[PDB]
Design a protein around this ligand. Structure first.
Ligand code: NA
Ligand code: NA
Lengths: 292, 292
């Protein structure tokens, strides 16, 4: 494998960025951490545009529908982004459920959602009928969707299992991220931990929407012409972003501003686990800018 | 391996029961299902006693402290049992935490419990200090215990992770049973599904108290002289009871009144997974009685 976790700098940086037609970024851990933008990040995005290179964003975060996700970007200092550049697991879960939900067109099945109002909004926008929405003048639940659910409960887990007793009922998860570090130094459980409970209790394996599934790259290509061979994938999490990159055939860049540490990358290398090793790393994405 | 999933009947039955000094039973799925005793079960227990063979009971169910567990037995038609014959994951979790909790004798650490009042009662009876109990005139949490928690929540999961940020804080689970079938034909999530969430979110592997750990057999032997070579283990769940039996060196009998199906036993056999194959099976434990 060519992925040898090289520090991207100098001539190599200019040639890599030179060749690249476009760059896909995760957001948390890459552009910002909590409320603080990574210094130089907004400038890198400006420079990319002015070099005529495309930028798209690919987040496993299922908490916000696209419009509030756009706000999130703008709030943290990232200007004239178009909402169409932003892809989340919530958006891509809605797409998938539209594509896959079984049953007739003619009364549709409902989705039982474990997740918050932003995820629910994204689903309704795709035309999906949700369990627990107002009933007509109770639809069959045809999918269970496990999202980031800060109100997860035993009762909700039990109801999910009830729906999943029907083998035709889909089980979908927005992502399998196990936990996330917060700016106050603590951690919050991630969707992967909730998916673990639901899969264990139901005996069913979830379809996973988010990275490291290739699915989000399918959603992106639906909308944009991107040649994976000429696209950089830039992320902070090896098991999610870097694995995604390799599965899609992109050149992968680990940034060290987020979850994964350089020594974890180098440990995967030594163990010959090349799918979890980035092609390149940078301390922060501010290091990329001078290559343009 | 000798475990060839033979139907225990006739001469073989008389010689197996003849040799046996004692029999360990699970309760749910074996002695009863929901509110209904297995016909002939109370009689088998009577006959065992009158043949001078010991009977002990070994349940992963962490919902009841021993006294209410004894009630449960009596309610379902099982008479003069002594409470000392009954071993549960709740009882054995309390034991383990007494043995393993780190810190000084002199102010002790507290256990953060995910579980109900019966589990909490069992812990307090062993002299353990629980997080969220009245404070003196907040102790350091030194263990997280994952039990059967019908009030499990995201918030509780998040608090558990906070305690587990300390590598010295133990993570213990009462059992890893993924789900359970109810008498109304539905399923309830099991402790294993909650443990899956806690292990995923914390990145830590739980110490498991219940079957198929050998630990409960250690607790039993603490109190009773039992030769595993001369003890039958009788259970309905291959991955829990039958695996436990093999790990302890007992002769294993699958009863078909519970979770596991005969064809699952025979499938493990064919795949050479001998640790999950019983030595013998019976349709119900009523079939054992005539061997005495
Ligand atoms: Na990230
Ligand atoms: Na059982």
């Amino acid at each position: 494998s060519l992925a040898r976790c090289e520090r991207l700098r100098g001539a190599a940086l200019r040639d890599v960025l030179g060749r690249a037609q476009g760059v896909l970024f995760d957001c948390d851990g890459v552009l910002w951490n909590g409320e603080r933008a990574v210094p130089g990040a907004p400038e890198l995005l400006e420079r990319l545009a002015r070099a005529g290179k495309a930028a798209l964003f690919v987040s496993n975060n299922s908490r916000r529908a696209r419009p509030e996700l756009a706000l999130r970007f703008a709030r943290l200092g990232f200007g004239g982004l178009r909402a169409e550049q932003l892809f989340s697991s919530a958006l891509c879960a809605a797409r998938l459920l539209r594509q896959r939900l079984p049953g007739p067109p003619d009364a549709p099945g409902a989705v039982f959602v474990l997740g918050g109002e932003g995820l629910r909004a994204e689903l309704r926008a795709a035309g999906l009928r949700l369990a627990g929405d107002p009933s007509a003048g109770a639809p069959r639940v045809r999918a269970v969707l496990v999202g980031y659910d800060e109100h997860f409960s035993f009762a909700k887990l039990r109801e999910a299992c009830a729906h999943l007793r029907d083998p035709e009922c889909l089980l979908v998860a927005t992502d399998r991220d196990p936990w996330h570090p917060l700016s106050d130094g603590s951690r919050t459980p991630g969707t992967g931990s909730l998916a673990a409970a639901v899969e264990t209790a139901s005996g069913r394996q979830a379809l996973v929407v988010g990275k490291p599934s290739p699915y989000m790259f399918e959603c992106i290509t639906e909308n944009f012409s991107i040649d994976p061979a000429r696209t950089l994938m830039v992320g902070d999490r090896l098991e999610t972003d870097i694995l995604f990159g390799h599965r899609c055939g992109m050149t992968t860049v680990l940034t060290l501003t987020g979850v994964s540490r350089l020594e974890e990358a180098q440990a995967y290398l030594a163990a010959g686990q090349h799918d979890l090793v980035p092609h390149y790393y940078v301390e922060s994405i501010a290091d990329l800018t001078e290559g343009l």
